[PDB]
């Protein structure tokens, strides 16, 4: 997350860390949507251009975390995966259209002060809230700035970072990139004239874009961090999987395999 700040303890109890067993390293963010289903972006698991194709035995999910690197004894829970499900029409060839995957945990996780699921939107919450100008919130342990590289500066955070960003109107999203954008994506970020900054960045993929309903006070997950060109570049915006457009596939998978 670029230009965000440290999260408060318990501020995003649905945030999940996808963690590679060997080498032990951060893979992607993810979110807890029930006691045994985690939602993430499909490209975290399958991306043939970079030869990524992970299976269940390659990964662990770590839930209830705050520190990026510490094993948080007595707070975090670690679970193994029973099965991964990638959207059958995920388009990794062109534009990461339908970038969404579900993961079934081997055993249910117990909830706590630090571990609690986010809600998935219904038609009407999506309708009232997914509007240009309305802000949502993104969280993750990804890089703090685009570059740094293998040089000086560091750039990986000590704890979970958070940033609040406005949804941008679809014309503006479309005119900022050469990628073909679909109805299954939306973009968010400040415009150059607005004088505030912020964005997701490398390592934040798969993480939740959430909004708090003013009608019932609950937090709903509206987006999944999917792609962007650079991190926090003026005139460029972050793109997110539109979770409500893909909800019928989510419901189907959980009803058939849960």
């Amino acid at each position: 997350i670029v230009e965000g700040s440290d999260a408060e303890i318990g501020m995003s109890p649905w945030q999940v860390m996808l963690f590679r067993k060997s080498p032990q390293e951060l893979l992607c963010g993810a979110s807890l949507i029930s006691d045994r289903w985690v939602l993430t972006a499909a490209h975290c698991l399958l991306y043939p251009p970079w030869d990524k194709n992970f299976t269940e035995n390659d990964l662990l999910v770590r839930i209830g975390k705050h520190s990026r690197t510490r094993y948080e004894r007595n707070i975090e829970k670690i679970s193994m995966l029973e099965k991964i499900y990638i959207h059958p029409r995920y388009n990794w060839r062109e534009n990461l259209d339908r970038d969404i995957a579900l993961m079934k945990l081997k055993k249910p996780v117990a909830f706590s002060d630090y571990i609690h699921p986010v809600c998935l939107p219904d038609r009407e919450t999506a309708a009232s809230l997914l509007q240009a100008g309305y802000k949502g919130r993104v969280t993750g342990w990804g890089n703090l700035k685009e570059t740094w590289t293998a040089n000086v500066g560091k750039g990986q955070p000590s704890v979970l970072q958070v940033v609040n960003l406005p949804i941008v109107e679809r014309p503006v999203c479309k005119d900022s990139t050469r990628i073909r954008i679909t109805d299954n994506m939306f973009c968010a970020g400040y415009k150059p004239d607005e004088g505030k900054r912020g964005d997701a960045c490398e390592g934040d993929s798969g993480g939740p874009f959430v909004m708090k309903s003013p009608f019932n006070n609950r937090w709903y997950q509206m987006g999944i961090v999917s792609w962007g060109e650079g991190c926090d570049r003026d005139g460029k915006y972050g793109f997110y999987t539109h979770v409500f457009r893909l909800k019928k596939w989510i419901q189907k998978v959980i009803d058939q395999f849960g």
């Binding site: 318990g10 109890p13 029930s34 699921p117 309305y134 949502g136 406005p166 006070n217 609950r218 937090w219």
Partner: peptide, 29 residues
């Protein structure tokens, strides 16, 4: 998950607000 989704143990359930959530609620004009 389910019935209780989206209500945080340390904030909504205790009626405490985090430091920047009013920014989100203030933009829902």
């Amino acid at each position: 998950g389910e019935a209780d989704c989206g209500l945080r143990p340390l904030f909504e359930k205790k009626s405490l607000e985090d430091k920047t959530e009013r920014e989100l609620l203030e933009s829902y004009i």
